[PDB]
Structures are given as C-alpha cells and as structure tokens.
From a paper:
Vertebrate type-IIa RPTPs comprise LAR, [name]σ and [name]δ, which share common domain architecture with a single transmembrane (TM) helix flanked by a large extracellular domain (ECD) and cytoplasmic tandem [name] domains: the membrane-proximal [name] domain (D1) is catalytically active, whereas the membrane-distal [name] domain (D2) is inactive. In mammals, presynaptic type-IIa RPTPs form trans-synaptic adhesion by specifically binding to their cognate postsynaptic organizers through their ECDs for inducing synaptic differentiation of neurons. To elucidate the structural basis for decoding the ‘splice-insert signaling code' in the type-IIa RPTPs, we determined the crystal structures of [name]δ-ECD in complex with IL-[name]-ECD and [name]-ECD.
The following [name] and [name] domains are aligned in a straight line, similarly to the isolated [name]δ [name]-[name] structure, which we determined at 2.0 Å resolution.
Numbering used by the authors: 328 to 520
Amino acid sequence: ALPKPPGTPVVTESTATSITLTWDSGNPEPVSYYIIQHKPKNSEEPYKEIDGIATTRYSVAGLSPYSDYEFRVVAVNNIGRGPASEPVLTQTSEQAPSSAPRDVQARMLSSTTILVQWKEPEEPNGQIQGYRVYYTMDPTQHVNNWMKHNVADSQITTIGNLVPQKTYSVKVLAFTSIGDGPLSSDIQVITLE
C-alpha cells in the first residue's frame, strides 16, 4: 500500500542558514525516499519541496538568519507518495548585522553637543540590541581608539562634551546578541554655532 505519514520531523541542528531535521519513517515496510516540504512560517502559499532524500535525516540550507520556518516530511515507496507528516516549526539562528545603519546624519546643537541619527540596517540578521556611535577629531585612528557611546535599540542620540570649532567624524554600527555589524562610512559634523 501507499506509505503512511512519516513521524513528525524533529529539529536536531540549526545554524543561521540551515536547519537539520530527523524523523521516524512512520512505516512498517521500507520506504524508498522522502520529500521535505518547507516554507517561511507566515507564507500562505504552498510548501516548496525537496525531492529524493534517501535517509531519515537532512540539512536544509541556505535559509536566511533569524527567520521562522515550517517543515513537513513525505514518504515515497514503489506504490507512490504518502500523506505529509504533521508540520514542525522552528527558527534559524541569529548573526551579527551584515549591513551598516543607513542615512547616518549629524548636526550641531551647540558648540559642545551634536545630534546623531540613523535608520535600521537592512540586514540585521537578528534582534538589534543596540548601536555604538564612534566619533573623533582624528579619523585616521583605528576605530577602536575613537571615542565611543553605546546606545539601546534607538535611532537618535545626542553627544556632548565636544570641543568647539572642530570637525568630528562619526561612524555608527548596530549589534545583535551575536556581534557587532559593520560601521557606516564616515560623516562629518562641525561644532560651530
């Protein structure tokens, strides 16, 4: 007869871009192979299908970081294709952001304070936990020797105690739990009233 549905698949490995599934055959007799059905959790469209999986374990790659996914497994034998299992829900791991905060802007508020603001990076790869604002009077320095101000998840901050009539270079990165993303390319702001 046709195969019965495989056992509900179990996620046993995950990375930022892959999910590894294992399942029970769900069947008394041997199965020829399996088909994995996968989609984003909140897609309302039909599952995509990976055909011809010859074992009861498979890693689905390259998915995107910090994303919700739905999977099912289908068994096939010589008679044909059985019903899909019950779905499993899961989520790929986070990464550091892989793009810079966008539209980074700064303007003078006084001779000693500026206003810095930006937009969220397009590629956060995770929950943004905060931003780090780098600023200096000498941008030839390594960024780790610039002055630094840490911020929570936000898009605007003020920075004070600046020396008047100076060009300050400013760079901003976002960070997730995993790590720091890239720095925006330098902008300049002058402490001139």
